[PDB]
Amino acid sequence: APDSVDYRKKGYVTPVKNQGQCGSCWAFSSVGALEGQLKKKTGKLLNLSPQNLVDCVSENDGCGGGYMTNAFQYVQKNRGIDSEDAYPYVGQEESCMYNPTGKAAKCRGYREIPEGNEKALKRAVARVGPVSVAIDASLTSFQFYSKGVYYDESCNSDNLNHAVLAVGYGIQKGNKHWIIKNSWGENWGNKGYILMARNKNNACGIANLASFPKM
Amino acid sequence: APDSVDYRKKGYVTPVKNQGQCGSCWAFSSVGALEGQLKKKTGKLLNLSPQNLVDCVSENDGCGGGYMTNAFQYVQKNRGIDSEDAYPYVGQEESCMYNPTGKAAKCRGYREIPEGNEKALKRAVARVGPVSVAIDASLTSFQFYSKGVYYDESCNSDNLNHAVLAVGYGIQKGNKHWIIKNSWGENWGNKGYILMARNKNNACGIANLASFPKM
Ligand SMILES: *[C@](=O)([C]([C][C][C][C])[N]C(=O)O[C]C1([C]C2=[C][C]=C(F)[C]=[C]2)[C][C][C]1)C(=O)[N]C1=[C][C]=N[N]1
Ligand SMILES: *[C@](=O)([C]([C][C][C][C])[N]C(=O)O[C]C1([C]C2=[C][C]=C(F)[C]=[C]2)[C][C][C]1)C(=O)[N]C1=[C][C]=N[N]1
């Protein structure tokens, strides 16, 4: 694996979205990972539908949270997921309005990164592409993040509560990091992104519940 | 009165929730106590709405924290609280959207446990049911709790920063404890729970800010 990787430069990452007043971070994380594999397999980058996931993944809790793996499973068993244009994001749970006509991607399943292994996560990102990850984003320090490589001793890897997307990794000012795409809008963090400490004892639990879809 | 009590066995406790990033621990603590009394009064166990409290208890600070007593006061004055289904949790403060038709419980008052009295808290849990309590959960040792009876001399009884639910009490390997339900997801601690030292000089301030609603 390369010392650094940034899928944003390769056109594998769509613009930063804003999930609004809906606990759908898991759906944005999921579509982000799907968009990466779609681009890698078809060569086209397009926005997939997080609303499709919020409304149709029965095992998850819609605007109340959910597992990225359940989303991948849904896409697989559903034989597809709609594009954002065909199933627009509205910010609240609605009745399932999925339709094969707007299908823009499929899923053959998913894999979970060995729990707590950042080196494994690194390998996955390098070989597969953007990977869905879960972290503790409950600290005010995370909420008001502006720049630099984020590390807070108070982060709790035993309290995973937010789903985001690892689109790469590298180092800045001698500090290794993960390039994380959030879904709180472009005005949050650094243009919607946050560099999170890498190889710093699994800070914020970045490698505790990571996964990627098979396409 | 009994040596041991566990309301989870009696079906007075709903599944462990994940509060996300919103500082709503007080709301989950409040609904937990309300859920217990509702089961007792109607025989039914159901999720009540923490979002309803976050958005409508103007006396509190929404995602910035709040008092469980102010929550009970609101339910009383408001003539009710919604079920989770009728007012779903989204992990961010919204405009107050209380639905009167979705009312699932009422509150005719509440009482505050005499400050620092663990004996009184014990009697309350035994007689009333689950009780809302506040503790010092700022220690790394608390964050990474996994098993046994939690005790850390560095805990500060007068640093009440986290709201949880006491669903019982007992003794493990000779160590008296309180059975505490957190709102950091089922993967935190021991299936979302933590046993905290009981009768150990009011450890972590367990009996300094405890209260329960009446139905
Ligand atoms: C976001 O962080 C969601 C919010 C959940 C609470 C509204 N969290 C989330 O989905 O995390 C997913 C898990 C933990 C989990 C699993 C199942 C659940 F039902 C709930 C939580 C981490 C790995 C799985 C989020 O959307 N944040 C947000 C809310 C409002 N704006 N941003
Ligand atoms: C939680 O511990 C909240 C967070 C408040 C700060 C964001 N604390 C809390 O509400 O505690 C309630 C008190 C103390 C208090 C009173 C009034 C306030 F305005 C603030 C605090 C204890 C008894 C009353 C919490 O939600 N933690 C959490 C946030 C994200 N994940 N977990």
- The CATH number for A70's domain is 3.90.70.10
CA–CA separation, B12 and B88 (whole Å): 20
CA–CA separation, B204 and B162 (whole Å): 10
> Can you name the residues that pair with B190 across neighbouring β-strands?
B193
CA–CA separation, A40 and B49 (whole Å): 42
CA–CA separation, B14 and B143 (whole Å): 22
Tokens encoding A190: 């650094």
Tokens encoding B185: 């997801």
Instruction: Give the resolution in Å.
Output: 1.8
Which residues from chain B sit within 8 angstroms of residue A156, using beta carbons?
Answer: 143-144, 184, 188
Domain that holds residue B162: 1-215
8 A C-beta contact, residue A81 and residue A104 = yes
8 A C-beta contact, residue A186 and residue A192 = yes
CA–CA separation, A69 and A75 (whole Å): 10
Distance of alpha carbon B181 from the chain centroid: 7
The number of distinct structural domains making up chain B is: 1
CB burial of residue B69 (10 Å; 0-12, 13-18, 19+)? buried
**Which among B29, B192, B21, B31 has a CA at the least distance from the CA of B91?**
B21
Q: What is the CA(B209)–ligand 2 centre distance, in A?
A: 12
Calculated CA dihedral for residues A67, A72, A73, A75, nearest 10 degrees: 130
**DSSP code per residue over B29-45:** HHHHHHHHHHHHHHS--
**Which among A19, A7, A3, A32 has a CA at the least distance from the CA of A179?**
A7
| Chain A contacts to B (CB-CB under 8 A) | 21-23, 62-65, 93, 137-138, 142-143, 153-154, 156, 158-162
**DSSP code per residue over chain A:** --S-EETTTTT--PPPPB--SSB-HHHHHHHHHHHHHHHHHHS----B-HHHHHHH-TTS-TTB---HHHHHHHHHHHT-EEBTTTS---SS-------GGGEEE---EEEEPPTT-HHHHHHHHHHT--EEEEE---SHHHHT--SSEE--TT--TT---EEEEEEEEEEETTEEEEEEE-SB-TTSTBTTEEEEESSSSSGGGTTSS-EEEE-
**Which among B18, B11, B44 has a CA at the least distance from the CA of B130?**
B11
Q: Locate tokens 């594999």: which residue?
A: A37
The answer, yes or no, to whether any atom of ligand 2 lies below 6 A from the CB of A4, is no
> Can you name the residues that pair with B1 across neighbouring β-strands?
none
**Which among A201, A103, A88 has a CA at the least distance from the CA of A155?**
A201
- Residue A120 falls in which region: left (phi positive, over 0), alpha (psi -120 to 50) or beta: alpha
- The experimental method is X-ray
What does DSSP assign to residue B16? P
CA distances from B186 to B37, B190, B191 (A): 23, 8, 5
- Residue B172 falls in which region: left (phi positive, over 0), alpha (psi -120 to 50) or beta: beta
Q: What is the CA(A33)–ligand 2 centre distance, in A?
A: 33
Q: How far apart are the first and last CA of chain B?
A: 22
